[PDB]
Each structure stands twice: as structure tokens, then as C-alpha cells.
Nucleic acid binder design. Structure first.
Ligand SMILES: [Mg+2]
Ligand SMILES: [Zn+2]
Ligand SMILES: [Zn+2]
Lengths: 69, 117, 52, 103, 1140
DNA sequence: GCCCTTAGCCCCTTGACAGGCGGGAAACATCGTGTTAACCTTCGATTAAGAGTCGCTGAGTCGCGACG
DNA sequence: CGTCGCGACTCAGCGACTCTTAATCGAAGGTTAACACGATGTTTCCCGCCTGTCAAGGGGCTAAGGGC
């Protein structure tokens, strides 16, 4: 339901908007998304909708997870 | 039995249509490749068994698992699983029968009633 | 045998296929034999032909 | 539309490559070809290509894993060596080549 | 894990280490019991058990034992997966020469010791004996008669020995050493002329350095032990009917085993020397056919008559790693259904049949039922969805809510062919596709099965929502034109809404709001002919604009209200007729100025608006729709009379051309022009109001489905039909499709149209081949660096023919970062900065003043070490935003170049593009001058003037005239190779770009220049090494070598210089660093040998490499994950440096 | 309200089968050998009606000079 | 003061990999010396060891009812 142009202004790469959004959705699977309501939406769509407030915070967690151990 | 003895195995690369595309090798099925669905029931049968065994006695659940093997694939017999717990006698068979008759009620054997098919 | 209807049987029976054993294959045809010669007039239809 | 419709999440797989069969014969799957994989290659959808031709079709050890993960609830997968690459390296190893992985 | 796959020669010891048991009998299974034999092509103890953890003879089939081996059968108990990985080996009684190295284009076995393949092939087949250890009896004398073998041996019976065959060639390869041979060839390559011997010496030195560097011994091309493919790869599954279906490789391996057993029995039996050598020759031929089967006599199977495929035949055709195995994987979780129009759906929502959504989302349905608690177990869930219970449909609509599905059309020519859609559980069994998006798919609804895919992963399900969504694929990757523009119906509706006529009810009746127009139209006071005044907000200046009472129309207001509120847009765009081109420019301007959300919402609204106003309009085609020109019979009679006046006296060809060109080819547009003029005139009824516009004329003018050529063919003169050779028909063809065509004219029509129809089916194959070549030459052209440190760029000049511009300079330069700041002519004012993005505003400012070519940074001038840069590719063609790192720029450009195919066209359009991309010498090879000023005469009596040096056939220059570099003697069709050898690389790139643009404009498919720029850059990845010292390679070489070799030579001193060489798209894989990328689409028997003997290791840097290997692609989301992996590795290294 | 007495359930000891994987012993269907000597001592297909190019070979034409 | 004795020379010539991209339905036809022990498996029951019933008996523990 949420477009990419509305949420790509914060992540002007269009690929970090995918990986970071997937990481945010996975975190929502264990409890996340305290910034925007779900509005009866799936995990990826809600992550893309709330990506306007976790542009840098999501990339750091993904980078830490990519690191071994 | 002499006839029908696989007189000539057809080439698996033979054409299937009017052209030489999509040979017979690309259309043969697999009777040994485990389908992902049948693996799903395997993983859930590993989950649905660990849950039903969590209600039994700890030592009794351990001896029942040793009778078949959930983590260890070495399927032990009655006496072999008997020595691991107590004196190897009919007591192990008795507790196994009691456990087997235990999870046969609609409460414990609820999700397994549609599992055996 | 294309037997979807009585016309398919007739058009399949009256089908001159330039491919098969003894003639050019589907690749062997080329842009030459895939044309219609002037002598084809009256003897072979130029419109009814497979699109593939 | 009946004779042409088709939908097979997981059907009978082949033998030479362990891939899902083609066509609507026996629960086939829409073959994802080189010219149709380039559509996702030019796209940024590399995770799809890392799961559509890696764990979806040609990973006998990864297909069941991804199916169990999807059934459990988590949309996570893993696929390192597809069966296509395995059969390719086995065929190349059949000749005088020394196709062998490392590090 | 694994990475950096490397190939080399398979050592006999390493081959034995790979195998698990030597097969000595050509027996697969038993005729009574279907079990593997002891030692054969299908073995249990050699390749593993046939059943999962079920040993042979029913002894360890309980799975309790995993490493225990049987006693009677000797097979170790293991799952059936090991039967596909376990290899085998056949220790041949005599060696055998590899078919890939013996018989091929480069004779890799003949390059050793400098012996031609014509004699190496004779010494291997035991025809001409070879001499070894000479000491009369010259080295490599190649003697066959027994005179010198026995009669000449009567010199004491000492020091006389020679061999023949595969063993002889193996001993010869063992005798030659790599280091000494390379050292001998080094001095033979330098300090000498090397006129003809250099061509072979270069290849020999390359092969020797590959063998020495890779560590492979020279005597490994001939193999004493042949490895066997595992039995699971070549299966023997019992087919339905008791007839086993054995693979092609099984028969070849059985033949090889039979030959080996026969040779072993002959050697142990002490057979005649002519039969053992003949047995070795038969075994060698069998091993040759088992590998390639093409270089030999094409040995056919004993049962079938089809040519048996081999280990090489599999990889070559589509049925191996090329198409069937690796690239074109038959992915599951997919669906193919006939598509139907989905106008009730949104642009980002495709219809999915309920009967297909269950089979597609079976695991997702199971997960939703398990999490929701509806189903206790997976088996119960499968039993629930299998019967299609009414409670699972509610879960299917809930699971398919934001899970996009990839819609894959049968033919794909660009990245928009795979677009993910939020599925809607529509009734029926057909994919309800959106009307606006099917144009980008190339899928009409006349029958087009759109294969639907479902991404399983959470990232793939999210990757299909950020990039593969239909809302994000508005602008096609070919150029800056939106591909979501209405094709046929919405464009017709908008044209009917925008057509304004001075005569209509409600003239100048001012309305209050937008709803007033519809309220008055429902009352019958105002018509839809767009001639009434009302109020509307245009929003031209900064901020909100007042509701100015515009003098516009009601029909253009219904479309104007759908336009988003933003400056530079409004009713000023709808003031035109709103044709297909104008409506595409409107969807482009709304996306160029406003965002993608508003653009997609306007596209969704206008489709519904155009649909609602097209059905209510009544655009049905009728007999009076196609109006034949009343001034047609007279012009036809006058033309046919003029065709007879000059025919009385008669040259016949001149009179014919006067009667076919000036008589029928001319005045056929006159009749068509008169028809168009009579069709454009709006007939006014007796009540002063025009009756209506012709529906066919509306379709032709709006651009939905009509055209001038189609109009003339339908109602005009129909033109003149073609011929098999291309000549125009001379007979009179005066009849339109509205009238009755007689038999002869219709036969000529179907004689001229079947040629184009075959071109749609034959030239499309050439289009597919060109697209395959481009994506595999441009796969490495991936944007990785955002901004490179380069300043030079290609010059982009607006192409012009005659006196007008063919393409606007503002459009050619739009979306490309400038190299140097463009200076406006006349006044020295910096209109554009040096290294900033060229936005649409910058392009408009540049086009506001007439300017010459502007220095533009392109992918050609990229100084990036790996991949392409971001400040050079410019703007991604997907949207108005600049290109981001990770996009497959090369793949996008290849798709954009292949999209104009199937409608192109010798040298007309498609063949010319294929010739220019492959860089072949045309039929008339042009020779560049390179001389300045005066030009002298060439040598005396050398059949041609090669070149004249003045340092200070057909000819087009004089002997004393002042010639300037650039003017080359040719009648046309220059050569790009000569252009690079004489002229610069940027000049060749500009020539190729202009040629491709001229071709695509003559055909009509506009393609962006950068899409050709990336292909031209990928064609320039090789550079001829002219280094006099430190490197003996003079032929072409990848640029990474001079990036590394030229840097290493400076740390030892001779200066190194290399001129860039241009190779065709097909020749890109010939010298590419990666072999999997080259062995994918190119010939698999030459690139593998070029990579096996060279020990080429695939670093998996490209896109096609990771696709075949299965790992994540280094482009796109995979590119970003690779960057994250690299930064994580750097962080781990920094952390390790902290703790010593 | 607490203590004594008796009944019911749980547990232990023996056991008379029942047959049941499995090697042995045996009766019977395979699988690789031989062996016989009356006459022919070159069998046979299969492209070859489009098309861009890689890898090699072998003919006719010239320079440099020596000996009359 | 010519040529030819003797050398390269590039020119021809000859071989040779692919046929987009998903799809419309599964299998697919021939070749026709005779016999003999032997060593080699194949297949049946038959007891050996052992596994699994339910029962019999009993006691020991637990608990419920009655009396002071
Ligand atoms: Mg269509
Ligand atoms: Zn066994
Ligand atoms: Zn660059």
C-alpha cells in the first residue's frame, strides 16, 4: 500500500531501503515498530512505511548482525 | 518374466515435441526426492512429538525417546533402553505400554488424530 | 492430428509441412522458404499458416 | 484458461538436476530462464535471484528448509550450493577439468 | 562455505582421489532385480546406497548405522544424496587424449612442442609412429613404415626405441618442460622479426605460462583414468511401462567401459600389435565421444538414431548449464494463467485466481493457519487446503495482503517484464492484470500467459515491494518516457474528452466547480465536446494558486482535476488534443515534476476516467467510420491513364519505375492525404452543431491503434506490395480493405505481408541472440562507485539531419552528469556547473539557448577499477532520481537495446546493430587516413596502397592533395576496428552511439545513449599490450592486467604502454577474466579449455557467475549486502587489530 | 475426633506360549567359460536449399647477388 | 649488364558454435547356430534367542468405614 518514492527520500539508495526494511520487519517479528501503527499491514509494508524514522538505526543493527559472532 | 525385461532403455535425452526442445529427461519425475511438504510434516512431527512427550514423566519420556530415538538415531530395543534406566526387565515394557496408552485421549492425542491419515 | 473440429481435421490433412525427415527442419528453413512464391497462387494458401 | 492455468508451489522434481518439472504435466513450475532472470538481475532484486534459482528450485537441502521456515512463520532462508551447480561441477569433474571449490 | 571456484587439469591421482571405486564392468543393474551391479556404471559400494540410509542386501537399512560398510556387498550406508556427489574413475589400460584439447579450434595438445594437430592427430590414432630419444632418425621424424623401425635398426641393436599413440603423446608431453620451453620462446619472441612464427609463439608462450603458473603438468591433457559422472546425474529411473529411461551419458560410459575391458583383455592376452593399437584407437574415440561427441564421427546410440549427447553436448545446448540447468531453472512456487484486463484493480494490484492462489501460497497459508490457530498441525492444514474448505479462503485473502507476486510474461525484453503486484483474490481462473501495466509487459490480452511467481523470503517479499512493484516501474528503462502510458483505450477516452468543437450545447456557460460540469452533463444542458467554460486551479506559480476562471473546456477539466496540484503542471498540459504522445508526455511531466505516488495515482485515475468516458462515448467501428475519399476514383483513373501514355513507345525498366514509383508509389500518398483531409474535416449538421468525429480518425490521431500507414492500407490506396527479393509490385493495386479486394491483389498483399510476419518470427530470434550477447557482455558493468575521481567525459552533441534536429540535445544529455561546466554561447555565463547532476530544470536551461555538444561524464570515461561509477552513468532510467550504486547498469542497457528488437528491419536495423556490436569488418572495409596534409603513393606493385608515412583498388584521394585525418576512402559502412586503431576510443564510442541511434530512429524505438555507452564500454574491456619488456603478450588483454601489470613493472625499473582494442560482444567472453561468465553462453568446449589449461579461477565478481553458482548477485540488493559484508569484514579486521 | 481394621489399587514374580530375523542345509535356477571344424576373407549413410565469425594449410608474385 | 638460384610474403583456401524468452500432450520400433559340467547364487523350513501377551499368584501401599 505504501509507495517507495514516499519513503525513498530518506534512503536515497533504493537498496538499503530493502535490506534495512527487511531487518526492521524481522525485528518486528520479535517486537518492533513502535513508531507507526500497523494499520492491518504485513511486516515488509509496515517496515517500508516506518522507514522514515529508522534510516540510520536500521543500517547499524544490520551491519552488526552481518558481523561474525 | 522373460518378456518385459527392459529390452531397450530409451535415451533420456530424446525429444518430446515436434522439435528437439524439452527432452524426456526434463519431464521424468523423482520418486526419491523428498518433497518440501513431506519434510514439513517431518519437522512438525518432530515438534508435535516433543510437545506430547513434555507431559510425560522426565525419566519416562527419556526412556520412551531412547526406545525409538528423537535426537539419537540409534533405535534401541526394549532391553537396551531398559539398562539405561533401571533393571532390564518387563518394567520397561510396562512403562512403555502405560505411556503409549497415556497419550491416546482427545486432550493429548488431539493434533495427532489427523496426523496418521 | 489436430482433431479439434471438422475443419481442423481437413486443414491438418491438407497440410503441406516442409519440415520432417527428407526436408528442411524448422531451423533449416530460413527467410527464403518461409516466403510465398508467385506459383503458390491457387495451389497453396498464403494466409493460413502457423504463426510460430 | 483451464487447460492453460497452472499453480504449483512444490511439485515433482527432476533427476538430472533435481529441479521442479516443467509444463502442466505434473505440478510443473514456470521455468525462470536466462532472459527472464536478467529482469531481476538488472533490477535490484538479487535476494530473489539468490532464492528463486538458489533455494526455490535447485536446492534439495535448501528447498525443504525454506518450506519449513515459511510454514513455521519466519520468512528466512539459506542456500549455499544449488543442485544445478552441483550437477554442473560433477559433469565438469567428469572430464579432465579440475572444477573444485576453495576457501 | 566456498568461494573463488577454480578449474584446471584433472590429475589422474586427483581423479582417483575423487572417485570411490574403479569400475571394470559395463553393467548398470540386474535384469531380474533392479539393483546396482558390483562394479559398473551404477554401483552401490562405489557411488553410495540407492536408498536413503538403506544399505544393500537388507542388512543396515534401519538408519542406526551411518558410517558402517556392508560385508557381502561392501556398500557403506548413507543417504541417497551421496549417490549424486560420489564420482568414479576408469583406469584405462592405455591413455586417451582429451577431446577438448586434442580436437578443437586451438589445438591445446598440438601447442606443446610446436607440432601441428594434423600430425598430432595421426600419432594419436596409431597411423604414423613417432620417434623418441633420437640418436638418421631425426627427432619427431613421424615415421610409419617398419623399414626405419627394423631395417634401419641394424646398427648394433642398441639405443633404438620409439612409441606411438596416446602413450607416445603422453611421454612427449612429459618430456617437454614448461620453464625451459617458456624461456626458449621468450628469446625467440624478442630481438627478432617474428613475422609469421609470432602468431603461434604467442599462443605457445601463453599456454606454457598458464601450465607453469597454475601448476598443471603438461602431460595431463591425455588422461589414463577417465572420471565417471555420478549415477544420480545420469539416472536409470524405471519409466511407466517397464521401460527404463537411461541417460545419454550412461550409454557413452558403458561404451567406454567396454572399450577399456576389451583393451585390458587384449593386452593380457598378448593380441597382435595392430589390434591392440587399434583397440587403443577405439577406446580413444569412445572417450572422445563421451566428452564432446561433436569432434568425432557423431557416434549414435545402438537403440535410437538421435546423436547421443555427452559431457560437452550438455553444457553447449539449452539442456545444460546454459539454459536448463543453471540460468533457466524451472522455479517452483510459480503459476501460469491466461491474463484478463483488470481495470477495477489498482495499478499495483494484479488479479490472482483463487484456484491458483492456494497452490501458490500453500506454505504461507499453512503458516497463517498455524499462527491463527485454525489448524493444529501441518498435515491437518494440508488436508484443509487440499479440499478448499470455506474457512481457508478467508485466510488466503489475509495472507495475500501486502505479499507481492512476480508477474512474468512469456517473452521478456527488459527489466519491466518481471513486475511484482499485490495480488487480489479475484474470481475465475485468469490473472486480472492492470490495463496500464500490460503495455510495459508487452502482454496484450489476446492470449498471453503471464507466469506468476511468489517470493518466499521476507526480503524477496519486500524486494518485490520496493523495486519490482508496478508503481515503481512507471518510466521504462529504455528512455525517459513513462511505460505506464495508456496504450489503446484510456488514450482514446482522453482524446474523446479533449476534442473541442465550437458547436455544442452550453456554449461559454461558466460553471462553479468540477462537479458542476458533471451535474450539468447529467441534465443534458452541456455536452462532452469540450466547449464550455468553468473554474479550475492550475497551480502554476510558487505556493497555492487562486481558483482562476479559465477559458478551458469541460472535457479537459475531467482530466485536469486528476492532475496533481504542483507548479509547472495543470490545465496547460491538457489544452492539447491529449493524444498518446501528449498523454505520455503528461505522465512524464507529472513524474518529472511531482513524485511517483501522485504519478501512479494519476495514472490509476485517468485509466478509470478514460475507461468511463470511452464506453459512454460509443467509439464503435462502423462502415461509415472508415470513409473512403470521394476524390479517389478520379485520381486512380488519371494515374492509370498516365501509366499508359509513356508505355506506348516502350527502356522497359525506366517505364516500369515511372509506372510503379511516380504512378503508384507516387499519388498513393496523394489519395491517402486526400482521405486524411476529408476525414479531419468536422461535418456540421443542419443545426449548426457537428455530428461527430470518425472513430477510426480518432484512433489514428490519438495514437491508440491508428496510423497514417494503417489508415492508407485500410481505406486509402493500400500502397504496393513487396516481392521475395524486395522489389515493388508493378501491377495496379487500387482497393482498400473497406472495399472488396480481388484474388490477385489480396494474393500480392499476403505475399508482401508474410515476409514481415516471418520477420516478426525470424528476426525476433536475432533480437533474442543480440539481447543474450548484450546481457552477458554487460553483466560486469555494474554501478559500484558513486563518484569516481575522473574529470574527462564523452562529448554529447545533438544529432541533426538536413536542417532540423533529430533528437533534442536536452533529451540526450538529460540524466547524465557533466564532465566540464557547459558554457552558454554568446555570453560567458555558467549555465550548468561542472560536476553536478543534470536535472530536468538544468536540461531546460541548456536547451533554452542554442549550444554545441556538452562535456558529459559517461560510463566510457569511467576510471573505476571494478564495475561502473555512479557520476558517469548519470540518471537511472527507472525514475527521475540519479542512478544508485548496485544497479545492474549493463543488464539494464542490454535489455533496453534488446527491447527494440522483434520490430526492427542485410544492414537494415537489426543486422546492422548486430554487426556494429560484434565489431565485424563490413563488406566494404573502410581504411582511415591518419595522414595530415600531403599524401604520397604506396609501394610499387604490391596490389594496393597500404599506408604512406610522411613524418615532419578503389581510391578516394589524390597523389598530391592535402589530406586531413578523418576522411577515409570508402563507399560507406566504415569499420570500428580501424576507427579504434587510427582514431580515438571516444570517437569510436560516439560513432557506435550515433549509428545505433540512427538505426533505432529509422525503426522508431528511441533508446537512451547511456544504454549503448555501457555496452561500448564493456566491448572495450580489452587492451592490446604493446609492452616491449616485462610482458610478452601482444594480443588483447583485460584492462585489469595493465591496471596490475603496468603498476608492478614500475616497481622494478621499462615504461609500459597499451592501446585499447575493441572486440565484439560475442568476443567479450573470449578474453574475460571469469570463465563461468564466459562458459555460460559462449562455446563451452573452447572457453573451458581456455580456462582449464590456464587455471582461470572464478572470483564470482560478476552477475552471471553468482547466478550460476547460486550465491547472491553482486548487483542490486545483493550489491548492497555485499557492501555490508565488506564493511563488516573491515570492522572485524579492525577489532582483531585491537586485541593484537 | 482419632485409632484400628479391612477392602481396593498398584506393583512384583513366573510363565506358556508364537513367531520371527536369520544362518544352515538343501533343492534348484543362473553366468562365466569352453567346444564344432564340409562353401562367400571390405558392411554401410548422409549431410549437402540461412547465417556471423575462430584455427590451420599451400600456390604465385617480388628482393639479394654471382658467374659469363 | 640481363636473368635466375634461392628465399619470404601475404593472400587465398579449408575446417567450425548458435538459433530469443514462458508456453500447446506421454509414451515411443528392430537382431534371431546348439550343448555341457561347474561355481554361483536363489529360495524354503527350522530351529536359536528373543522378543511381547495376558493370565495366575502374592504382597505392599493407599484409603475408607466403624468403634471408643
Ligand atoms: Mg497480447
Ligand atoms: Zn548390504
Ligand atoms: Zn566513472
Amino acid at each position: 500500500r505504501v509507495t517507495v518514492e514516499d519513503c525513498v527520500e530518506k534512503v536515497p539508495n533504493r537498496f538499503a531501503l530493502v535490506l534495512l526494511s527487511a531487518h526492521r520487519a524481522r525485528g518486528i517479528s520479535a517486537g518492533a515498530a513502535l513508531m507507526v501503527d500497523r494499520d492491518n499491514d504485513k511486516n515488509p509494508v509496515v517496515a517500508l512505511r516506518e522507514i522514515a524514522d529508522d534510516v540510520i538505526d536500521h543500517e547499524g543493527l544490520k551491519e552488526h548482525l552481518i558481523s561474525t559472532l | 518374466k522373460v518378456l518385459k525385461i527392459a529390452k531397450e532403455p530409451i535415451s533420456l535425452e530424446t525429444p518430446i515435441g515436434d522439435e528437439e526442445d524439452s527432452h524426456l529427461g526434463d519431464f521424468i519425475e523423482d520418486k526419491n526426492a523428498i518433497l518440501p511438504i513431506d519434510a514439513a510434516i517431518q519437522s512438525n512431527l518432530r515438534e508435535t512429538t516433543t510437545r506430547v512427550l513434555a507431559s510425560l514423566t522426565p525419566r519416562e519420556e527419556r526412556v520412551l525417546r531412547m526406545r525409538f530415538g528423537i535426537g539419537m538415531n540409534t533405535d534401541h530395543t526394549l532391553e537396551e533402553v531398559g539398562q539405561q534406566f533401571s533393571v532390564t526387565r518387563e518394567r520397561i515394557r510396562q512403562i512403555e505400554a502405560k505411556a503409549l496408552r497415556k497419550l491416546k485421549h482427545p486432550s493429548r492425542s488431539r493434533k495427532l488424530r489427523s496426523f496418521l491419515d | 492430428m489436430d482433431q479439434t473440429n471438422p475443419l481442423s481435421e481437413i486443414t491438418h490433412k491438407r497440410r503441406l509441412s516442409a519440415l520432417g525427415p527428407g526436408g528442411l527442419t524448422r531451423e533449416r528453413a530460413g527467410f527464403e522458404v518461409r516466403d510465398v512464391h508467385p506459383t503458390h497462387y491457387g495451389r497453396i494458401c498464403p494466409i493460413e499458416t502457423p504463426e510460430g | 484458461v483451464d487447460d492453460k492455468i497452472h499453480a504449483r508451489s512444490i511439485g515433482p522434481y527432476s533427476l538430472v538436476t533435481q529441479q521442479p518439472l516443467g509444463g502442466k504435466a505434473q505440478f510443473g513450475g514456470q521455468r525462470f530462464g536466462e532472459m527472464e532472470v536478467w529482469a531481476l538481475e538488472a533490477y535490484g532484486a538479487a535476494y530473489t535471484l539468490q532464492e528463486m534459482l538458489t533455494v526455490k528450485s535447485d536446492d534439495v537441502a535448501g528447498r525443504t528448509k525454506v518450506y519449513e521456515s515459511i510454514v513455521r512463520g519466519d520468512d528466512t532462508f539459506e542456500a549455499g550450493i544449488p543442485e544445478s551447480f552441483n550437477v554442473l561441477v560433477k559433469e565438469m569433474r567428469s572430464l579432465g577439468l579440475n572444477v573444485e571449490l576453495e576457501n | 562455505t566456498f568461494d573463488q571456484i577454480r578449474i584446471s587439469l584433472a590429475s589422474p591421482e586427483k581423479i582417483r582421489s575423487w572417485s570411490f571405486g574403479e569400475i571394470k564392468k559395463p553393467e548398470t543393474i540386474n535384469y531380474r532385480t533392479f539393483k546396482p551391479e558390483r562394479d559398473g556404471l551404477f554401483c552401490a559400494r562405489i557411488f553410495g546406497p540407492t536408498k536413503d540410509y538403506e544399505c544393500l542386501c537388507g542388512k543396515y537399512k534401519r538408519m542406526k548405522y551411518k558410517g558402517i560398510i556392508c560385508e557381502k556387498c561392501g556398500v557403506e550406508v548413507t543417504l541417497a544424496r551421496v549417490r549424486r556427489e560420489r564420482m568414479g574413475h576408469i583406469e584405462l589400460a592405455s591413455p586417451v587424449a582429451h577431446i577438448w584439447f586434442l580436437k578443437s579450434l586451438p589445438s591445446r595438445i598440438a601447442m606443446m612442442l610446436d607440432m601441428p594437430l594434423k600430425d598430432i592427430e595421426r600419432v594419436l590414432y596409431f597411423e604414423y609412429y613417432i620417434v623418441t630419444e633420437p640418436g638418421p632418425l631425426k627427432q619427431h621424424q613421424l615415421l610409419s613404415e617398419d623399414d626405419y623401425m627394423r631395417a634401419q635398426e641394424e646398427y648394433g641393436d642398441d639405443s633404438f626405441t620409439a612409441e606411438i599413440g596416446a602413450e607416445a603423446i603422453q611421454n612427449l608431453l612429459k618430456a617437454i618442460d614448461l620453464e625451459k620451453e617458456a624461456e626458449r620462446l621468450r628469446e625467440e619472441l624478442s630481438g627478432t622479426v617474428s613475422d609469421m612464427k609470432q602468431k603461434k609463439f604467442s599462443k605457445r608462450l601463453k599456454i606454457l605460462e598458464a601450465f607453469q603458473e597454475s601448476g598443471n603438468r603438461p602431460e595431463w591433457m591425455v588422461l589414463t583414468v577417465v572420471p565417471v559422472i555420478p549415477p544420480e546425474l545420469r539416472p536409470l529411473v524405471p519409466l511407466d511401462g517397464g521401460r527404463f529411461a537411461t541417460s545419454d551419458l550412461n550409454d557413452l560410459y558403458r561404451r567406454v567401459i567396454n572399450r577399456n575391458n576389451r583393451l585390458k583383455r587384449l593386452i593380457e592376452l598378448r593380441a597382435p600389435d595392430i589390434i591392440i593399437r587399434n583397440e587403443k584407437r577405439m577406446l580413444q574415440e569412445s572417450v572422445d565421444a563421451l566428452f564432446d561427441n561433436g569432434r568425432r564421427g557423431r557416434v549414435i546410440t545402438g537403440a535410437n538414431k538421435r546423436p547421443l549427447k555427452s559431457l560437452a553436448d550438455m553444457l553447449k545446448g539449452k539442456q545444460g548449464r546454459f539454459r536448463q540447468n543453471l540460468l533457466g531453472k524451472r522455479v517452483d512456487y510459480s503459476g501460469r494463467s491466461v491474463i484478463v484486463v483488470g481495470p477495477e484493480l489498482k495499478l499495483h494490484e494484479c488479479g490472482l485466481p483463487k484456484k491458483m492462489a492456494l497452490e501458490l501460497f500453500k506454505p504461507f497459508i499453512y503458516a497463517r493457519l498455524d499462527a491463527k490457530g485454525l489448524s493444529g498441525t501441518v498435515k491437518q492444514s494440508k488436508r484443509m487446503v487440499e479440499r478448499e474448505q470455506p474457512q481457508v479462503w478467508d485466510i488466503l485473502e489475509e495472507v495475500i495482503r501486502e505479499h507481492p507476486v512476480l508477474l512474468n510474461r512469456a517473452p521478456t525484453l527488459h527489466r519491466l517484464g518481471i513486475q511484482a503486484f499485490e495480488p487480489k483474490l479475484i474470481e475465475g481462473k485468469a490473472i486480472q492484470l492492470h490495463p496500464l501495466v500490460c503495455a510495459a509487459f508487452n502482454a496484450d490480452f489476446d492470449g498471453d500467459q503471464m507466469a506468476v511467481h511468489v517470493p518466499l523470503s521476507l526480503e524477496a517479499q519486500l524486494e518485490a515491494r520496493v523495486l519490482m512493484m508496478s508503481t515503481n516501474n512507471i518510466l521504462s528503462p529504455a528512455n525517459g518516457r513513462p511505460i505506464i502510458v495508456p496504450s489503446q483505450d484510456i488514450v482514446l477516452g482522453l482524446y474523446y474528452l479533449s476534442v473541442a468543437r465550437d458547436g455544442e450545447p452550453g456554449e461559454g456557460k461558466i460553471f462553479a466547480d468540477l462537479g458542476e460540469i458533471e451535474a450539468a452533463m447529467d441534465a443534458g444542458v452541456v455536452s462532452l465536446h469540450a466547449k464550455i467554460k468553468a473554474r479550475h486551479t492550475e497551480m502554476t506559480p510558487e505556493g497555492v494558486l487562486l481558483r482562476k476562471v479559465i477559458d478551458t473546456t469541460p472535457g479537459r477539466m475531467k482530466i485536469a482535476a486528476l492532475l496533481p496540484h504542483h507548479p509547472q503542471i495543470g490545465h496547460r498540459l491538457i489544452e492539447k488534443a491529449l493524444t498518446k504522445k501528449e498523454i505520455g508526455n503528461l505522465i512524464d511531466i507529472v513524474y518529472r515534476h511531482c513524485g511517483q505516488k501522485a504519478t501512479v495515482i494519476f495514472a490509476d485515475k485517468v485509466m478509470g476516467l478514460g475507461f468511463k468516458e470511452a464506453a459512454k462515448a460509443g467509439i464503435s467501428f462502423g462502415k461509415d467510420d472508415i470513409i473512403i475519399p470521394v476524390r479517389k476514383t478520379a485520381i486512380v483513373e488519371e494515374t492509370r491513364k498516365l501509366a499508359e501514355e509513356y508505355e506506348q513507345q516502350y527502356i522497359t525498366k525506366g517505364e516500369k519505375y515511372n509506372k510503379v514509383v511516380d504512378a503508384w508509389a507516387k499519388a498513393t500518398d496523394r489519395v491517402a492525404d486526400e482521405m486524411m483531409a476529408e476525414l479531419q474535416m468536422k461535418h456540421k449538421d443542419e443545426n449548426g452543431r457537428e455530428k461527430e468525429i470518425n472513430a477510426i480518425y480518432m484512433m489514428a490521431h490519438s495514437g491508440a491503434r491508428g496510423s497514417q500507414a494503417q489508415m492508407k492500407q485500410l481505406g486509402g490506396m493500400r500502397g504496393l506490395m513487396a516481392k521475395p527479393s524486395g522489389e515493388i509490385i508493378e501491377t495496379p493495386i487500387v482497393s482498400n480493405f473497406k472495399e472488396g479486394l480481388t484474388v490477385q491483389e489480396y494474393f500480392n498483399s499476403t505475399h508482401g505481408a508474410r515476409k514481415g510476419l516471418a520477420d516478426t518470427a525470424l528476426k525476433t530470434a536475432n533480437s533474442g541472440y543480440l539481447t543474450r550477447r548484450l546481457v552477458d557482455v554487460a553483466q560486469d558493468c555494474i554501478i559500484v562507485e558513486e563518484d569516481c575521481g575522473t574529470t574527462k567525459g564523452i562529448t554529447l552533441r545533438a544529432v541533426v539531419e538536413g536542417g532540423d534536429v533529430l533528437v533534442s540535445l536536452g533529451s540526450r544529455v538529460l540524466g547524465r552528469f557533466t564532465a566540464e561546466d557547459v558554457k552558454d554561447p554568446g555570453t560567458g555565463e555558467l549555465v550548468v556547473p561542472a560536476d553536478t547532476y543534470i536535472d530536468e530544470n538544468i536540461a531546460d536551461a541548456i536547451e533554452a539557448a542554442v549550444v554545441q555538444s556538452v562535456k558529459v561524464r559517461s560510463v566510457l570515461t569511467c576510471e573505476a577499477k571494478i564495475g561502473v561509477c555512479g557520476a558517469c552513468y548519470g540518471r537511472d532510467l527507472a525514475r527521475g532520481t540519479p542512478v544508485n550504486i548496485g544497479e545492474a547498469v549493463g543488464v539494464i542497457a542490454a535489455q533496453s537495446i534488446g527491447e527494440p528488437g522483434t520490430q526492427l528491419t542485410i544492414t537494415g536495423g537489426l543486422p546492422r546493430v548486430a554487426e556494429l556490436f560484434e565489431a565485424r569488418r563490413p563488406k566494404d572495409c573502410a581504411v582511415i587516413a591518419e595522414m595530415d596534409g600531403r599524401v604520397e603513393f604506396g609501394k610499387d606493385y604490391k596490389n594496393k596502397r597500404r599506408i604512406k608515412i610522411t613524418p615532419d583498388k578503389h581510391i578516394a584521394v589524390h597523389d598530391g592533395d592535402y589530406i586531413t585525418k578523418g576522411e577515409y576512402i570508402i563507399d560507406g559502412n566504415p569499420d570500428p576496428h580501424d576507427i579504434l586503431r587510427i582514431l580515438g576510443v571516444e570517437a569510436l564510442a560516439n560513432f557506435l552511439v550515433d549509428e545505433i541511434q540512427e538505426v533505432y530512429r529509422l525503426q522508431g524505438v528511441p533508446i537512451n545513449d547511456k544504454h549503448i555507452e555501457t555496452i561500448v564500454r564493456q566491448m572495450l574491456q580489452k587492451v592490446e599490450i604493446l609492452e616491449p619488456g616485462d610482458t610478452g603478450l601482444i594480443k588483447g588483454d583485460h584492462l585489469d592486467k595493465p591496471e596490475f601489470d603496468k603498476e608492478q613493472e614500475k616497481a622494478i625499473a621499462r615504461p609500459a604502454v597499451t592501446q585499447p582494442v575493441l572486440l565484439g560482444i560475442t568476443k567479450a567472453s573470449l578474453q574475460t577474466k571469469s570463465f563461468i561468465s564466459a562458459a555460460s553462453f559462449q562455446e563451452t568446449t573452447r572457453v573451458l579449455t581456455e580456462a582449464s589449461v590456464h587455471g582461470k579461477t572464478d572470483t564470482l565478481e560478476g552477475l552471471k557467475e553468482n547466478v550460476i553458482v547460486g550465491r547472491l548477485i553482486p548487483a542490486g540488493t545483493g550489491s548492497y549486502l555485499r557492501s555490508l559484508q565488506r564493511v563488516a569484514a573491515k570492522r572485524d579486521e579492525q577489532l582483531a587489530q585491537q586485541r593484537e
